[PDB]
Amino acid sequence: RFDRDRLFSVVSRGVPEELTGLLEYLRWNSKYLTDSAYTEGSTGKTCLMKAVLNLQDGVNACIMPLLQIDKDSGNPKPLVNAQCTDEFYQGHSALHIAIEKRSLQCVKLLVENGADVHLR
Known part of the structure; x- marks a missing residue:
């Protein structure tokens, strides 16, 4: 069993070990992180959105x-x-937003994944 509220506890802490069996949990439901229950209801604040706000010395590994x-x-x-x-x-x-937080590190590792840098 898993949910957004303990996923907030994951991205509040910055914990690599509770991530074990999460691809499996996404497969238990057959549903992805895009789920409106596993993003925040109004703001669509995904786990990554709070994982930015983790700010574990400007790196949440x-x-x-x-x-x-x-x-x-x-x-x-x-x-x-x-x-x-x-x-x-x-x-x-x-x-x-995170460039607001504005220690470098996250953006360049995300550049390797590759977000769109022309988003309105």
């Missing part, structure tokens, strides 16, 4: 395993380019 889970899942619309829906922070895409 578990984001790349999360991006690996995104690749392993076979997500047609990966969270690399995911965007907020309700107006309050609409479109934010946290990596775009």
Whole structure:
């Protein structure tokens, strides 16, 4: 068993070990991280969006395993380019905000995955 609230506890802590059996959990349900229950209801604040806000000395090392889970899942619309829906922070895409956090590290590792750098 797994959910967004303990996935918030994953990306609050920055824990590599609770990520074990998550591709398997996405396969238990046959549903990806794009799920509206596993993103935040209003803001669409995915696990990566809070994993940006983890800020584990400007590196949450578990984001790349999360991006690996995104690749392993076979997500047609990966969270690399995911965007907020309700107006309050609409479109934010946290990596775009994260340059606000603005220690380098995340952006260049995400560049290797490759988000769109022309997003409105």
